[PDB]
């Protein structure tokens, strides 16, 4: 617990830790949505992780977002440490510089590139899910959500299949700390890996991803090598964890509510907006900004250099957004969040990571329609940047299967 500020008034002291909240066992998501209950305020501080501002609303997170003046991406993570490290392209840029590195950047993740991914996203999801179907069981995280990702990047950056573990490992160590490496040191092992693949695709560019980014061009001149590789690295882990760990909160509560999968293996056109009320429903995603000087945001006076948490995840689970926010209806009318982001930096690949859930429980319940969590098991969930799912032991009679 880190001093208080004197700036920050004692009635806004709230210690909420983002790493390790109170009631993880209840859920992730339950336990981030004790911060909305009525006798806290719409922004209180930490003393946790450094000290922090947490903008708890949908409302101020919204605003914060779009006022990038005031809350700057330069160091958009906490820890503090980790926020000034991380120097990825654009999550760490503010605009307007941001602004053609955001368009080089959807080139080759955009709505584009995606209907051309289709076949590859189909074929991949069902020959993963039928080399399981068969078993009666899986650990849908290890089995399933983790190599779906990684595999789908690689096809896109053109990369050997071969280094995936490798990467796996490099991405991994950064994204799942164990304290035995920096932040920082991370980082540089997984650009080690990146450098030397920019410089072969700057001389002698193809037309993957990767060879796009390196001979890009921005406002008004040729990217840097620094900047590609700082463009690629984002490219590389933007799609990983998030996917990885949505994937997971989805088929936990599929797996836990067989009145709302069947309700989808009837009603298959009904999907798409079921992923839409899940990416409500289990949000994940919380970075922020810092600010760039003094300013008073609804009533709370913030100090140039303080940093501020903007849940992402929370904006639709706030009840001033949606009614009854923790109940899943598949058939909620105005299924307002902010999951992808909002503002300048808005997901570039929400349009690819839509599709990969759609695919993915299209291809799931067709296969394995009914399916439960291992009897006996606790499904534990972890909480951070990107909150997620340990593990998730799943269970079937491989009768009630079909190859398709
Ligand atoms: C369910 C999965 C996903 C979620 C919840 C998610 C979340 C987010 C969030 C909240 C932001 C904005 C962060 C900020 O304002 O600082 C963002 C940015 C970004 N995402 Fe995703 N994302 C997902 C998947 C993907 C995928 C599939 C890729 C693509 C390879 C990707 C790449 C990007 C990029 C490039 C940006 C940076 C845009 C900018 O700074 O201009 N995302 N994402
Ligand atoms: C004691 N002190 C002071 C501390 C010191 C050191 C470590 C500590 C840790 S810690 O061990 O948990 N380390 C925290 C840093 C983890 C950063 C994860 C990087 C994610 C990369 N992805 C993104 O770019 C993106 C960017 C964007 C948003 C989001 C999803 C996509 C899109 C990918 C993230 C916790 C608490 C305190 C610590």
């Known amino acids: 617990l880190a001093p208080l500020p004197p700036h920050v008034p004692e009635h806004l002291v709230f210690d909420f830790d983002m790493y390790n909240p109170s009631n993880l066992s209840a859920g992730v998501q339950e336990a981030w949505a004790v911060l909305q209950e009525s006798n806290v305020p719409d922004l209180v501080w930490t003393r946790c992780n450094g000290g922090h501002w947490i903008a708890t609303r949908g409302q101020l997170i919204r605003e ?14 906490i820890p503090r440490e980790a926020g000034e490290a991380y120097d990825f392209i654009p999550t760490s840029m503010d605009p307007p510089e941001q602004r053609q590195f955001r368009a080089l950047a959807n080139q080759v993740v955009g709505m584009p590139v995606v209907d051309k991914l289709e076949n590859r996203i189909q074929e991949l999801a069902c020959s993963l899910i039928e080399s399981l179907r068969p078993q009666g069981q899986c650990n849908f995280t290890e089995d399933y959500a983790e190599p779906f990702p990684i595999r789908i990047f690689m096809l896109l950056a053109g990369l050997p299949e071969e280094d995936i573990p490798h990467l796996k490992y490099l991405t991994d160590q950064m994204t799942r700390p164990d304290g035995s490496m920096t932040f920082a040191e991370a980082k540089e092992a997984l650009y080690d890996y990146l450098i030397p693949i920019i410089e072969q695709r700057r001389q002698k560019p193809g037309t993957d991803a990767i060879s796009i980014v390196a001979n890009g061009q921005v406002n008004g001149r040729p990217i840097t090598s620094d900047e590609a590789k700082r463009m690629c690295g984002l490219l590389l882990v933007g799609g990983l964890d998030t996917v990885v760990n949505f994937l997971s909160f989805s088929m936990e509560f599929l797996a836990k509510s067989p009145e709302h999968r069947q309700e989808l293996i009837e009603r298959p056109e009904r999907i798409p907006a079921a992923c839409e009320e899940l990416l409500r429903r289990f949000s994940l995603v919380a970075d922020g900004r810092i600010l760039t000087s003094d300013y008073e945001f609804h009533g709370v006076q913030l100090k140039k250099g303080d940093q501020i948490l903007l849940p992402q995840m929370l904006s639709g689970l706030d009840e001033r957004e949606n009614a ?3 109940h899943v209806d598949f058939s909620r009318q105005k299924v307002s969040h902010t999951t ?7 997901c570039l690949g929400q349009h690819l990571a839509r599709r990969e859930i759609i695919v993915t429980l299209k291809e799931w319940l067709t296969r394995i329609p009914d399916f439960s969590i ?9 909480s951070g940047i990107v909150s997620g799912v340990q593990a998730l032991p799943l269970v079937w009679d491989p009768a009630t299967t079909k190859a398709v």
């Open 64 to 77: 914060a977002y779009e006022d990038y003046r005031h809350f700057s991406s330069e160091c958009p993570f």
């Open 324 to 326: 009854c926010p923790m």
């Open 340 to 346: 992808f982001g909002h503002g300048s930096h808005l």
């Open 374 to 382: 291992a009897p006996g098991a606790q499904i534990q969930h972890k």
